[PDB]
Structures are given as structure tokens and as C-alpha cells.
Amino acid sequence: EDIDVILKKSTILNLDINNDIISDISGFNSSVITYPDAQLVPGINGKAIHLVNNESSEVIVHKAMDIEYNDMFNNFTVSFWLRVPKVSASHLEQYGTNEYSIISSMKKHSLSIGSGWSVSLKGNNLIWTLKDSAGEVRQITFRDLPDKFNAYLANKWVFITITNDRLSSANLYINGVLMGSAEITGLGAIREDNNITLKLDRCNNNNQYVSIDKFRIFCKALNPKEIEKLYTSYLSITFLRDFWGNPLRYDTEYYLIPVASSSKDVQLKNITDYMYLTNAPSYTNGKLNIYYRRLYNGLKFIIKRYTPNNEIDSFVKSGDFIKLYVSYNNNEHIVGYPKDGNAFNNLDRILRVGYNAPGIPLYKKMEAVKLRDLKTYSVQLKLYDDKNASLGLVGTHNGQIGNDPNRDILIASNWYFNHLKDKILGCDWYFVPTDEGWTND
Numbered sequence: 431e432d433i434d435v436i437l438k439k440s441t442i443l444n445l446d447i448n449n450d451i452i453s454d455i456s457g458f459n460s461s462v463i464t465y466p467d468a469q470l471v472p473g474i475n476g477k478a479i480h481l482v483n484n485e486s487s488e489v490i491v492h493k494a495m496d497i498e499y500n501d502m503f504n505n506f507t508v509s510f511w512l513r514v515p516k517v518s519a520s521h522l523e524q525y526g527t528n529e530y531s532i533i534s535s536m537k538k539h540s541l542s543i544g545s546g547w548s549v550s551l552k553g554n555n556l557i558w559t560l561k562d563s564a565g566e567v568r569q570i571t572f573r574d575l576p577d578k579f580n581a582y583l584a585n586k587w588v589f590i591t592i593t594n595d596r597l598s599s600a601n602l603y604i605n606g607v608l609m610g611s612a613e614i615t616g617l618g619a620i621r622e623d624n625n626i627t628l629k630l631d632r633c634n635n636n637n638q639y640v641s642i643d644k645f646r647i648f649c650k651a652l653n654p655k656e657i658e659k660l661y662t663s664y665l666s667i668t669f670l671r672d673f674w675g676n677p678l679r680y681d682t683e684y685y686l687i688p689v690a691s692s693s694k695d696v697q698l699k700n701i702t703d704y705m706y707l708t709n710a711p712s713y714t715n716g717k718l719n720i721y722y723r724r725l726y727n728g729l730k731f732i733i734k735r736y737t738p739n740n741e742i743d744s745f746v747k748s749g750d751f752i753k754l755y756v757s758y759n760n761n762e763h764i765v766g767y768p769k770d771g772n773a774f775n776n777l778d779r780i781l782r783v784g785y786n787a788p789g790i791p792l793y794k795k796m797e798a799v800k801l802r803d804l805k806t807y808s809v810q811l812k813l814y815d816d817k818n819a820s821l822g823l824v825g826t827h828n829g830q831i832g833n834d835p836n837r838d839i840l841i842a843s844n845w846y847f848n849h850l851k852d853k854i855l856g857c858d859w860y861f862v863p864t865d866e867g868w869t870n871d
């Protein structure tokens with residue numbers, strides 16, 4: 431009756447990565463065989479599986495005796511975190527009709543039937559297929575969003591869950607939201623392979639890769655409440671995340687984008703002066719129906735540790751004290767607020783980059799925190815003065831400095847602390863590192 435108990439009780443396969451080894455921690459003891467080129471990369475809470483396009487890049491799960499035919503006639507749910515690189519326009523043209531499996535229970539080397547289930551990709555479509563012993567087929571074809579900044583198969587970690595209720599439908603959820611469904615009555619016995627294979631199969635693109643984490647099978651069709659809890663159970667609040675959902679790191683260049691105005695990049699007026707938002711350039715392709723604000727323009731920021739601690743972790747944790755720098759012309763400039771510096775009426779402190787007036791204290795101690803919006807990969811930054819008093823969360827204020835044009839200028843303000851329950855808030859930032867999974871067309 432308790433969701434956590436149900437989730438635990440109904441789990442019959444649960445891949446975890448501990449001590450750089452992948453194994454089933456469900457309790458069923460299914461044997462996991464990791465081939466030489468199955469790689470391990472940063473995940474949602476630890477490390478994740480990374481598959482490249484060669485036959486040595488595979489993880490095979492040998493179903494234990496107890497779970498052999500659990501999905502022959504009974505309800506089941508498959509869940510996993512997934513990360514797929516953004517498909518280039520060129521690759522959509524070349525490979526858009528090429529459907530390839532990434533996860534499957536379908537045999538194929540002894541019986542040409544291929545009964546069982548599969549997770550496959552085709553261009554920007556995510557597909558779930560169930561095939562019974564007579565070859566009857568049912569599929570859910572999810573067409574991803576055209577806006578790649580907000581799409582699910584566009585280089586961010588996203589949580590997949592597909593429930594199969596044999597008396598009604600199969601439902602596909604992404605980040606706890608229902609994205610597609612198919613009636614599945616009319617299917618008989620699903621007689622699948624003894625192995626569950628994580629591998630790119632029939633992918634014509636040599637450079638394709640995918641990342642998968644927390645692969646889990648449940649012996650029931652989970653309801654929305656159970657799925658929502660399952661999804662949010664993976665969002666460990668201690669460790670901060672970059673835009674892609676990977677751990678935020680010290681000493682790495684990040685482009686900042688305000689969650690509240692995601693079409694905007696950050697720009698610097700001049701060294702020693704303020705920062706403001708600018709409209710990002712855009713990419714649109716009417717033929718392919720893809721578009722997105724372009725990434726990687728604007729200021730490059732770097733997070734540095736404020737002090738040592740007791741051990742040097744490369745990831746940033748909520749609560750960590752940091753120093754924020756902008757990397758400009760290969761020179762690094764600290765971000766902060768000068769004592770008595772220009773501020774808007776309400777005490778919104780105007781941030782300055784590389785400020786160096788002799789004798790004037792520059793407040794630059796910040797704290798990297800996660801105070802709201804658990805499901806989004808964003809962070810807040812809290813600025814302090816020299817006596818550890820809060821100067822506020824970093825955000826923007828609309829106005830003018832001197833005779834400059836009206837701008838959304840970066841500030842620190844304690845106003846945000848009274849509005850943390852709001853749906854959208856101007857103190858939320860995405861930290862975007864350049865990544866091979868996202869190249870602007």
C-alpha cells in the first residue's frame with residue numbers, strides 16, 4: 431500500500447553500477463555480462479552505461495529462472511534513464527529512416543520470429559514494440575518535440591518508463607509525463623529470448639552512441655503515482671547538475687542560460703562592469719521540422735572552490751561555497767559586488783566582472799544551491815558579503831545603467847527567497863558545457 435514498498439516489491443531486475451561493475455541488485459540475481467566496449471560515463475546518480483556502435487559494446491542480462499516468462503502474459507513495466515545525442519540535420523537526412531534497437535528481449539539468431547519487446551530509435555522517434563508468438567505486433571511511436579532545447583532525445587538525461595497492462599494498453603512516459611500509448615489487447619503469449627540485450631542493433635551510423643542508466647523491470651503496470659515517485663526517487667538533491675543532467679563540476683567552462691528566459695544568453699558590458707541578457711541566435715529547419723536556440727554563445731563561466739575542504743571532489747554539491755569567474759580573452763575575472771556599488775532601489779546589487787578599484791571591498795563569496803524545481807537541471811547562486819550576510823540570489827533586474835539601452839542586468843537580490851514556490855523564477859540558471867552530443871547545425 432506504500433508506493434516505495436510496491437516499487438521495491440515488484441522489481442524483478444535492477445541494474446546498478448558499483449565499484450565499476452554492473453550487476454542486478456533486484457534480489458533475483460540475474461547474471462549480467464559486460465562486453466569489452468560497454469563504457470561507463472557520468473550518470474544521474476553515479477555512473478551510467480555508454481554504448482557505442484560496434485559488436486563489443488553490449489551488456490547482456492541472463493534472466494534468472496524465476497523471471498523467465500514474466501512478460502509472456504502478465505503485466506510489466508520497464509524503466510531506465512536515457513541520454514541520446516541531438517541528431518544533426520545531416521544525420522536526420524541520411525539516417526532518419528533507420529530504426530535501430532538499443533534494448534531488447536527479442537531473440538534473432540535461432541528463430542526468425544523475434545518475439546518479445548524492444549526499445550528502438552528512428553531519427554527523432556522513440557519506439558516501444560511488443561510482438562507475440564504469432565508475430566502480432568503493437569507499437570508506441572513517440573515523435574520528439576521539434577524544439578530541441580526542450581526535446582527528450584536531444585542530449586539530456588531523461589527518464590523513460592513504459593507500462594504494459596495486458597487487459598488494456600501499453601503507456602510510454604518520459605519524466606513521469608504520458609507521451610504516447612497503444613491498446614495491446616489482442617496480443618497473445620510473448621515468447622522472448624532468455625537474454626535482455628543492451629546494444630545498438632541495426633544502426634547504420636558508425637558514430638551513434640546512447641547512454642542508459644538504472645535499467646529496471648517491474649512485474650506490474652505502474653500507475654502514474656508510482657511512476658512519479660519512481661522518477662523523483664532518482665533526483666538526489668545533494669549533487670548539482672549541468673544542463674545535460676550530468677554532475678556540475680568545478681574548473682570547467684559553462685555557458686549560463688536563465689531558465690526563466692531560455693532564449694537569452696549572458697553578455698558582458700566591459701571588464702569591471704556589468705552583465706546583461708542578449709537574444710541567442712537561432713537555427714530553424716522547416717523541411718525537417720527542427721529548430722532550437724543555438725548553444726555556446728555568450729560568456730563562459732568557471733566555478734572555483736572557495737576553500738579546500740577535507741577532500742577534493744570534482745563535482746559541486748549544494749551548499750558548497752564557490753567563487754564564480756568569467757573567462758574572457760583567456761583571462762579569468764571574478765564576479766562579485768563592490769561594497770556600496772551601484773544597485774537598484776530595492777537593493778538588487780549589480781554584479782561586476784573583474785572589478786578592481788583600489789581599496790574597495792569586492793564581495794565574491796557565493797554558495798551553489800538547489801532550493802527549487804527538483805526536476806529541472808538548474809542551480810541557484812547565493813552571494814554573501816564579507817560578514818556572511820546574504821546579498822541575495824543571482825538573477826536579473828530590468829532597467830538602465832547610465833545612458834545604456836534598457837537591459838535585463840545581472841544582480842543579486844534577496845527578493846527571490848520569498849518566491850521559491852513559483853513555477854518559473856528568475857534566479858534559476860542552467861550551466862551548459864560544450865558537449866559532443868550537441869553541435870549547432
Ligand SMILES: OC[C@H]1O[C@@H](O[C@H]2[C@H](O)[C@@H](O)[C@H](O)O[C@@H]2CO)[C@H](O)[C@@H](O)[C@H]1O
Pocket residue numbers: 776778825826827828843845846856
Ligand atoms: O529583485 C529582483 C526581482 O524583482 C522582481 O520584482 C519585484 C521587485 O524586486 C520589488 O522591489 C517590487 O516591490 O516587486 C517586484 C515584483 O513585481 C521581479 O519580478 C523579478 O523578475 C526580479 O527582477
